[PDB]
Structures are given as C-alpha cells and as structure tokens.
Amino acid sequence: TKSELAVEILEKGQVRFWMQAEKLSGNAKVNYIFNEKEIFEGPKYKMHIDRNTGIIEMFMEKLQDEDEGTYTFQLQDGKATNHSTVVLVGDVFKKLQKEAEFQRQEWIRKQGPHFVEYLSWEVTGECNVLLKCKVANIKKETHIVWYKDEREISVDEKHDFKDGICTLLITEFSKKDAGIYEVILKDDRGKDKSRLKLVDE
C-alpha cells in the first residue's frame, strides 16, 4: 500500500475517497464497506480503479448526516489481501460535510449570475447614500431586482455587461430610507441574493 484510504473534497464539492496500492494486476477485486455493510455503485457511490497508478477511488456528490461513520476498501489481488479504513466521525466528518456543501453551492452559484462583492453603502453628493455591489456572469436576459422591505424599487435597466457594478442612489438620505435592502440576480442559469440592513440611529 502506497497510501491508506483518505477523503478529500474536490472541485464542485465532490467527495473523493481514495487510496493507492503499490501495484495492481488488472485482476484485483475491491469491496467497498460503510459501517460494516457493503456498498455498491449507483446513484450514491461511483467507483473507479486505475490499473497503472494503483489508485482506487470512490466518489460521492455530498455527505448526508447518515453518512457519518467508518469506510473500508477491501482489496484482493491474487493471494494478497489488504484493507484500508478511514473513520469519518466527529469534527472531521462535520468539516468534510460543510466543506463539500460550501464548495458545491459556490460552484453552482458561479455558473449563473452572482455577486463578487455583496451590498455595501457609501455617502456621495449632497448627503445622498449610494448602495453598491459587484456582480459577475450577467447576461442580457438576467433580471436584476432591487427591494426595500420586500417591496420592489425600480432602477434603470442597463446592464449591457457581464461583470460590473450595480448601484442604487438614495437621494437626501433620512430616517424613511432605513430598512432591509436586497438585490436579486436571476435567470434560467441560477439565482443569487444580497442583503443590507440600513439603519439610521
């Protein structure tokens, strides 16, 4: 065994269980085990063996809570028999699960219109407040919608860009302008949201 069973998070948040054998014959057999029960290729687990490199892999799209536990690859090649086990319990499980969830959601988010910088505010002009954000992967069809307190606020609709700044000018800022501002980006590729609680005293 060149390396024992280990688990890492890949791009798109995929979960990769892998180990490396020094050598495989091409006639090797692997059994995959989770919490003392054999598991099989299908909608949940995908398995791969690369003969030349000795790499044996199992992939998952994400970790459900019930996926906490002990994983074993049982390897048989000729008379040689080995196993390698990883225990995914406690903090390591939580960390893997959260990292997978975060990376998967981030990859998805980025395939559509999304925020690069979330809402912030500045003062400009004659005591005005400008709300601003920075967005990316916008297309002509993308809807950009601004709200205060769940009520739409109309702005000029000129996003003749893919990446850029979106702003909302609040003229003569006063108490009536306090509230929860939101900007939604959306098209058939995805939806992203930003929020800003603007107070006045």
Author numbering: 1246 to 1446
Reproduce, without paraphrasing, sentences from the article in which this PDB structure was first reported.
Members of the myomesin protein family function as molecular bridges that connect major filament systems in the central M-band of muscle sarcomeres, which is a central locus of passive stress sensing. To unravel the mechanism of molecular elasticity in such filament-connecting proteins, we have determined the overall architecture of the complete C-terminal immunoglobulin domain array of myomesin by X-ray crystallography, electron microscopy, solution X-ray scattering, and atomic force microscopy. Our data reveal a dimeric tail-to-tail filament structure of about 360 Å in length, which is folded into an irregular superhelical coil arrangement of almost identical α-helix/domain modules. The myomesin filament can be stretched to about 2.5-fold its original length by reversible unfolding of these linkers, a mechanism that to our knowledge has not been observed previously.
First, we determined the overall architecture of the complete myomesin domain array, including Ig domains My9–My10–My11–My12–My13, from crystal structures of a total of three filament fragments: the My9–My11 triplet, determined at 2.5 Å resolution; the My10–My11 doublet, at 1.9 Å resolution; and the homodimeric My11–My13 triplet at 3.5 Å resolution. Remarkably, all five Ig domains of the myomesin filament are connected by α-helices that are identical in terms of orientation with respect to the preceding Ig domain, and they form a substantial, structurally highly conserved Ig domain/helix interface with an area of 350–600 Å2. By contrast, we have observed neither a common interface nor a similar orientation for any of the My–My domain-connecting helices and subsequent Ig domains My10, My11, My12, and My13. As the overall geometry of the IgH segments is rigid, the limited variability in terms of arrangements of neighboring My domains originates from the diverse helix/My domain connections. Whereas long six-turn helices are found in the My10–My11 and My12–My13 connecting segments, the corresponding helices in the other two connecting segments, My9–My10 and My11–My12, are slightly shorter, with about four turns each. Because of the smaller length of their linkers, My9–My10 and My11–My12 show limited direct interactions in their respective Ig doublets, whereas in the other two doublets, My10–My11 and My12–My13, the neighboring My domains are too far away from each other to form an interface.
